[PDB]
Amino acid sequence: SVVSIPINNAGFEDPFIEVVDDYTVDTPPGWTTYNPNNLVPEKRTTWTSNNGVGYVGPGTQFYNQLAPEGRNIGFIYLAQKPGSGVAGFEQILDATLEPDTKYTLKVDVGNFGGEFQKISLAGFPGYRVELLAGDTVLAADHNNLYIKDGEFKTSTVTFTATPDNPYLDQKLGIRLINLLQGTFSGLDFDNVRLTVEPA
Amino acid sequence: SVVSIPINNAGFEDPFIEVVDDYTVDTPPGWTTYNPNNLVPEKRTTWTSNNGVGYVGPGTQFYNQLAPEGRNIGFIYLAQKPGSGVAGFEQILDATLEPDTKYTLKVDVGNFGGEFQKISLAGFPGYRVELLAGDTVLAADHNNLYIKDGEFKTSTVTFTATPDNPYLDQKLGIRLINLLQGTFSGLDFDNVRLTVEPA
Numbered sequence: 001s002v003v004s005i006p007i008n009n010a011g012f013e014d015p016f017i018e019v020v021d022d023y024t025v026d027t028p029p030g031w032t033t034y035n036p037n038n039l040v041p042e043k044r045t046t047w048t049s050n051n052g053v054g055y056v057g058p059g060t061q062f063y064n065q066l067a068p069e070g071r072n073i074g075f076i077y078l079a080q081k082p083g084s085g086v087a088g089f090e091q092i093l094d095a096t097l098e099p100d101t102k103y104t105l106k107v108d109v110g111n112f113g114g115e116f117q118k119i120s121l122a123g124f125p126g127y128r129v130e131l132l133a134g135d136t137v138l139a140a141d142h143n144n145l146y147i148k149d150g151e152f153k154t155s156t157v158t159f160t161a162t163p164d165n166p167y168l169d170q171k172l173g174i175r176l177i178n179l180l181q182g183t184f185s186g187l188d189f190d191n192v193r194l195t196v197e198p199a
Numbered sequence: 200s201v202v203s204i205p206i207n208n209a210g211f212e213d214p215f216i217e218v219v220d221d222y223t224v225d226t227p228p229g230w231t232t233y234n235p236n237n238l239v240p241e242k243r244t245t246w247t248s249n250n251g252v253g254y255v256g257p258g259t260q261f262y263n264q265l266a267p268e269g270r271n272i273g274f275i276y277l278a279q280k281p282g283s284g285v286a287g288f289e290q291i292l293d294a295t296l297e298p299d300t301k302y303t304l305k306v307d308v309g310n311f312g313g314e315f316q317k318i319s320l321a322g323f324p325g326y327r328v329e330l331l332a333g334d335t336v337l338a339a340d341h342n343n344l345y346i347k348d349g350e351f352k353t354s355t356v357t358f359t360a361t362p363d364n365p366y367l368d369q370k371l372g373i374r375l376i377n378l379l380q381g382t383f384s385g386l387d388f389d390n391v392r393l394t395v396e397p398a
């Protein structure tokens with residue numbers, strides 16, 4: 001009844017990262033950078049706005065648990081002040097929107113804690129998880145879960161497409177967004193899952 | 200433990216409407232028209248984009264139930280084609296955002312069915328329910344519930360404010376939004392409730 005829709009690098013496991021608490025600052029393979037407000041530069045370093053992948057394993061200062069799936073998470077850090085806009089990850093899938101089908105999108109959202117180069121990582125920017133067809137946000141969880149520093153929680157987004165939906169046959173998409181509505185203005189995501197079932 | 204925050208005309212019961220399936224086309228008392236894309240004109244008639252209040256009682260063609268609360272619902276109709284933007288209701292409250300507090304916003308969302316002047320009311324535009332502080336959308340339910348023609352479902356939006364939240368002491372607000380992502384491009388709301396409890 002319930003079928004999984006394939007997602008590339010759905011757990012941010014590519015690339016492999018060896019050293020505890022290490023990270024990349026380039027867009028994770030299989031994803032693109034969602035950048036509607038031009039907050040993230042094309043060339044990134046540690047302290048520019050950025051996104052990438054990070055290893056969360058034993059030894060980590062960031063959570064009271066390990067990565068929800070595998071070794072790694074995906075993260076977005078925004079250096080601009082709260083209110084400046086949003087940015088995140090986007091992936092357009094090969095699957096298309098089909099009628100009489102209920103879609104369930106799940107992703108784990110992480111509010112890491114700790115301290116980085118004497119800067120407190122306490123606080124959280126807020127998140128939004130979106131399911132798309134074409135350019136249209138069909139359904140989204142805008143920041144409904146309370147996630148304390150050092151923990152992950154699972155966001156669930158659902159959508160049912162009827163035969164009259166204007167966006168049938170358009171490509172499905174997923175966005176994972178840093179809302180930049182608080183500091184420390186970084187957050188993590190892991191274990192993106194998309195399933196389908198009859199409406 | 201759980202305290203209710205007062206909302207004006209929270210069930211759209213003002214004005215009273217006598218005749219089955221009758222409606223107004225002016226902004227409900229206590230609310231304003233949320234109009235970020237200028238879709239709703241200042242002066243409305245039956246077939247312009249509009250909003251107002253409507254009686255849902257025995258005799259109605261619109262639902263297989265009566266109004267969720269009282270006699271009336273509040274509605275938003277958008278005549279522009281899907282994708283043209285959004286509009287709805289907004290109300291700014293006297294309550295302000297307070298730390299260590301969990302807010303729960305509930306509203307019933309209705310997908311009316313039937314036929315109006317030979318135009319089918321089947322289909323739905325999509326909804327978004329927002330909790331605000333100041334100008335900031337703290338949390339929102341963007342269209343997560345599947346609501347068939349002729350029924351209502353309750354949307355629940357939650358948000359927990361921490362002592363570090365940038366928007367503490369700003370006025371709370373509520374938006375009820377027609378997403379204009381399908382036709383027939385009208386929808387109803389009723390029974391707005393906002394409660395608070397310790398985080």
Ligand SMILES: [Ca+2]
Pocket residue numbers: 011012013067068069070071072073190191
């Ligand atoms: Ca992973």
Ligand SMILES: [Ca+2]
Pocket residue numbers: 111112113121122123124149150184
């Ligand atoms: Ca944090």
Ligand SMILES: [Ca+2]
Pocket residue numbers: 210211212266267268269270271272389390
């Ligand atoms: Ca009512």
Ligand SMILES: [Ca+2]
Pocket residue numbers: 310311312320321322323348349383
């Ligand atoms: Ca309808």
